[PDB]
Inverse folding.
């Protein structure tokens, strides 16, 4: 089919330790290539590629333009952070845990938020640190993550296996044990 | 040591005349504006109960992106975008149990331009009832991601396929799933 | 978002303090504007609050202070000049540059009362029209011209005219009619200086 | 609370 | 950087469909329509942020718009009513530009029920009073624009062919000749005050000029009197020794 032409723009707000430190970026893209940007730690627009030089010189020559962008960390970022803080930065959803066999022992952790999580495998009270394979953190695209942490072993009688999940949504470790 | 990131991402594509405006928090979509109905669509109903956004504004930024696209198309001497095919993955929301409600998730990643055809197939036949999807989600490398969902009752008899068409693929791509 | 301008018509004597009120409501970072409309002219931007500074200094000698706590942005000037007579409009916007819809206040008409240094109350007669007109002029800035007691007799309100070249100013009103009985002696029969000449 | 958008600048012609 | 509006003045009859035009050649994405009325400031009727985009302002009732081309934003009155009599202001801008609104010259529109009530004004100048000349050494001339309707007049004073502002004071508002009637004609007065010496010079020429904006070329007219079209009416007088 006929050629396509894509334009993208990204206004980014990077927060560190809440709103104590904030960095603002006004990014412009032609197709997949960023050609010009304003970095609040720099103070003015800079060409990212030669294609963006025209825009840097043009925008930088307007005092009022730079003035507005220099105040974006406050008039934009900080204001928006405060707006959704209760349902984003503070969002908490419990990890659903399920242990099933597959030879592997799988510990599937589903529907949790935020993303940082700790999943550990135990056998008769002793942690198994070798032979543990994780699929990594998987984003479901609906404000919930999921992860599968497998333990490479041959399930046996008398053996007790435990999956221990630690997450910000839980007050104390969540454990689910499996026995053959 | 970074903590949170909010991104207001937008794009406009010719000849399709398609534009997009959305907010992103640490990888998840907070909301996007439906350009046609001129309203804000929250990713989670709950969000829309605590916050609001002046949807019309999205149209103002989009109109500038159109003008900017034309300006950039000419500056680059009509250099078209290079198609980058998607990587497709199908997985469920949680562990599958016969006769228990679940959700099949079709993940389309790392592609551009932002135009794809996605169809769910059950035993070779198209399925639309209950399906939903997200708009084109921004990637830090400036390509895109997308999620399609299909709620379903697992059976030993049903077979599923997520079919994806993209100008970057020589042929439609089919990712398969069935109750193991 | 909203703005209110308490005080539609404001009178200030020259050399005195000019104060035009503006209060706003905003659930988002505010950007305020003060526009002025001098007679027979279009709106001009006087000054604006961009959050770059709480005290904004404008053109033509005007000033305004953004007070988040009082949710106010009053326009002020130390010494009123006759050329400040105009209508002033306060506006608020959600955009940092005022390039997206602005919400305007109801506006304030600023009238500057001049100090008549040499009062000289007087009603004169002047002379194609079936009328004869009477001129009541040179009264001090405290005389008030009432509307005619007759419906077939016309009396305008008082206005000031300024002869710049001579640094002179005068107040005046005009009455006219075509009734025979209408005479300049009694035209302004509604509370004038005992001093006024004829 | 109300989210506020950031303006997108018009490129140099 | 200019926003131009079709007409400066317009007279229309109730029930008629009126079109107010606004065009800008700066490739601005945003255009708005406001009406300005005494004690109400500027109220937003409709606005647009892109081609084909229409957004109701705060007082859309009775109006409609059209934005087919980026350059033009048309305001439309479906069935004109007298309360739509007002000063309409167009404004344009771009969200992608470091500055704001650019206003048009405005459009005074008066909606009347009967076009046969439209009349140009008569103009008459009244020379200074000898008494005033003697008592103050100054000479006040008076201009009377009477019998006009609607209130579409611009009065100016010209001395020796030069438009004058110093020494002039025109009434801020006209007065109805029959206050009770809603179709009553108006009258306006103005003063031009000069030095006695200047007035006593027979070489100095004074002229009071009033431009009236009434019916347009398109308006149909078959009454006996002259069509009350936009026109300049004036009176003059020379200095008197
Ligand atoms: C997506 O699939 C559709 C068909 O389902 C393609 O649509 C285009 O071609 C169709 C068949 O010739 C037409 O019926 C459509 O009108 C036409 N759609 C448009 C507006 O282009 C489309 O090309 C496919 N796109 C991709 C990325 O594969
Ligand atoms: C675009 O084409 C012009 C005209 O030949 C040329 O001078 C310029 O280098 C080209 N720029 C780009 C986009 O490579
Ligand atoms: C950030 O944490 C608190 C929050 O205000 C602040 O007092 C402190 O100085 C900061 N700590 C760091 C990480 O520097």
């Amino acid at each position: 089919t006929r050629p396509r032409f894509l334009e993208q723009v990204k206004h980014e707000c990077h927060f560190f330790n809440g709103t104590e430190r904030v960095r603002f970026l006004d990014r412009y893209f032609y197709h997949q290539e960023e050609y010009v940007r304003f970095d609040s730690d720099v103070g003015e627009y800079r060409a990212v590629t030669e294609l963006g030089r025209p825009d840097a010189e043009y925008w930088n020559s307007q005092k009022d333009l730079l003035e507005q962008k220099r105040a974006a960390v406050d008039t934009y970022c900080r204001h928006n952070y405060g707006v959704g803080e209760s349902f984003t930065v503070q969002r908490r959803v419990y990890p659903e845990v399920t242990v099933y066999p597959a030879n592997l022992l799988v510990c599937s952790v589903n529907g949790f938020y935020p993303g940082s999580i700790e999943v550990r495998w135990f056998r008769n009270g002793q942690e198994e640190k070798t032979g543990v394979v994780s699929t990594g953190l998987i984003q479901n695209g609906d404000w919930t993550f999921q992860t599968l942490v497998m333990l490479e072993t041959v399930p046996r009688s008398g053996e007790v296996y435990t999956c221990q999940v630690e997450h910000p949504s839980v007050t104390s470790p969540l454990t689910v044990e499996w026995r053959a | 040591k970074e903590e949170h990131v909010i991104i207001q991402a937008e794009f406009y594509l010719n000849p399709d005349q398609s534009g997009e405006f959305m907010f992103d928090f640490d990888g998840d979509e907070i909301f996007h504006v439906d350009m046609a109905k001129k309203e804000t669509v929250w990713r989670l109903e709950e969000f829309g109960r605590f916050a609001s956004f002046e949807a019309q504004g999205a149209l103002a930024n989009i109109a500038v992106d159109k003008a900017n696209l034309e300006i950039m198309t000419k500056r680059s001497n009509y250099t078209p975008i290079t198609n980058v095919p998607p990587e497709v993955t199908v997985l469920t929301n949680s562990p599958v149990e016969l006769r228990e409600p679940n959700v099949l998730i079709c993940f389309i990643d790392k592609f551009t331009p932002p135009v794809v055809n996605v169809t769910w197939l059950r035993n070779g036949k198209p399925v639309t009832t209950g399906v939903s999807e997200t708009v084109f989600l921004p990637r830090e490398d400036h390509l895109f991601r997308k999620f399609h969902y299909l709620p379903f009752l697992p059976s030993t008899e049903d077979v599923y396929d997520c079919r994806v068409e993209h100008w970057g693929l020589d042929e439609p791509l089919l990712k398969h799933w069935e109750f193991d | 978002q909203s703005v209110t301008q308490l005080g539609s018509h404001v009178s200030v004597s020259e050399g005195a303090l000019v104060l035009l009120r503006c209060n706003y409501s905003s659930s988002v970072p505010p950007y305020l504007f003060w526009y002025v409309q001098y007679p027979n002219q279009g709106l001009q931007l006087l000054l604006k609050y961009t959050s770059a500074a709480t005290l904004v200094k404008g053109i033509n000698g005007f000033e305004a202070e953004f007070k988040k706590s009082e949710t106010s942005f009053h326009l002020t000037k130390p010494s009123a000049h006759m050329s400040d007579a105009a209508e002033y409009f306060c506006a608020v916007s959600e955009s940092p540059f005022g390039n997206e819809k602005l919400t305007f206040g109801t506006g304030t008409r600023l009238t500057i009362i001049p100090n008549i240094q040499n009062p000289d109350p007087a009603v004169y007669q002047l002379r194609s029209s079936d009328k004869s007109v009477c001129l009541f002029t040179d009264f001090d800035s405290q005389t008030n011209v009432s509307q005619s007691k007759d419906s077939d007799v016309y009396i305008t309100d008082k206005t000031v005219l300024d002869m710049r070249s001579m640094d002179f100013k005068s107040n005046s009103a005009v009455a006219w009619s075509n009734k025979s009985d209408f005479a300049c002696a009694n035209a302004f029969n509604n509370s004038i200086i005992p001093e006024d000449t004829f | 609370p109300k989210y506020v958008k950031q303006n997108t600048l018009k490129l140099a012609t | 950087v200019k926003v131009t509006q079709s007409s400066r003045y317009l007279v229309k009859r109730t029930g008629e469909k009126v079109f107010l035009e606004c065009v800008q050649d700066m490739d601005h994405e945003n255009m708005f329509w406001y009406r300005q009325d005494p004690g109400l400031g500027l109220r937003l009727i409709y606005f647009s942020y892109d081609v084909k985009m229409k957004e109701k302002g705060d007082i859309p009732e009775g109006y409609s718009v059209s934005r087919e081309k980026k350059e033009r934003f048309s305001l439309i009155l479906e069935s004109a009513s007298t309360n739509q009599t007002s000063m309409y202001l167009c404004a344009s801008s771009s969200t992608g530009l470091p500055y704001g609104y650019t206003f048009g010259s405005g459009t005074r529109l008066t909606v009347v029920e009967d076009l046969n009530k439209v009349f140009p004004p008569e103009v008459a100048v009244f020379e200074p009073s000898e008494a005033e000349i003697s008592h103050t050494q100054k000479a006040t001339l008076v201009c009377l624009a009477t019998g006009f309707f609607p209130d579409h007049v611009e009065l100016s004073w010209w001395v020796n062919g030069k438009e004058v502002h110093s020494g002039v004071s025109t009434d801020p508002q006209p007065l109805k000749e029959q206050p009770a009637l809603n179709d009553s004609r108006y009258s306006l007065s103005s003063r031009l005050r000069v030095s006695a010496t200047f007035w006593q010079n027979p070489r100095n020429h004074f002229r009071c000029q009033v431009q009236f904006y009434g019916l347009s070329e398109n308006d149909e007219w078959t009454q006996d009197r002259a069509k009350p079209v936009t026109q300049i009416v004036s009176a003059e007088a020379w200095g008197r020794a």
Q: What stands out?
A: Residues B 115-117, 165-167 surround ligand 1 (CB under 6 Å). Strands of chain D lie at 2-3.
